[PDB]
Design a protein around this ligand. Structure first.
Ligand code: HEC
Ligand code: CYN
Length: 104
């Protein structure tokens, strides 16, 4: 997927409550800062949920492709809230960006 598409998608529908940069304050979501290679609920600061911990996997790309499709299917009992990134493109594009962003 395209990191440029990905960056726009992130700005439009992730960046509100997350950060990938150093310094980028913990918001409603935790700072990803080196997400890929870590497990569900590692980022120190935000209070994780049982369910996220129950899930207990390592994040790569496939995992987000699947998670971003249905947070409830991956993690049974999340916050709600958007349905999911229905567009497989938007997911891949986004993930390709995040791969960059979290490494810089
Ligand atoms: C703020 C309004 C949110 C939006 C929009 C996005 N995320 Fe988020 N995310 C949010 C919270 C509160 C949590 C913690 C778990 C909970 O349900 O309370 C998360 C968690 C994640 C995780 C899991 C690992 C972690 O570090 O916590 C990932 C991989 C994640 N979020 C990715 C992500 C992406 C790529 C988003 C844009 C499509 C996105 N989130 C939006 C809150 C919010
Ligand atoms: C974040 N979902």
């Amino acid at each position: 997927g395209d990191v440029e598409k990905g960056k726009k998608i992130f700005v439009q529908k992730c960046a509100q409550c997350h950060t990938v940069e150093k310094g980028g304050k913990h918001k409603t979501g935790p700072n990803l800062h080196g997400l890929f290679g870590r497990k569900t609920g590692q980022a120190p600061g935000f209070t994780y949920t049982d369910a996220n911990k129950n899930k207990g996997i390592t994040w790569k790309e496939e995992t987000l492709m699947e998670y971003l499709e249905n947070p409830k299917k991956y993690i049974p009992g999340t916050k709600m809230i958007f349905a999911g990134i229905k567009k497989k493109t938007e997911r891949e594009d986004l993930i390709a960006y995040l791969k960059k962003a979290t490494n810089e």
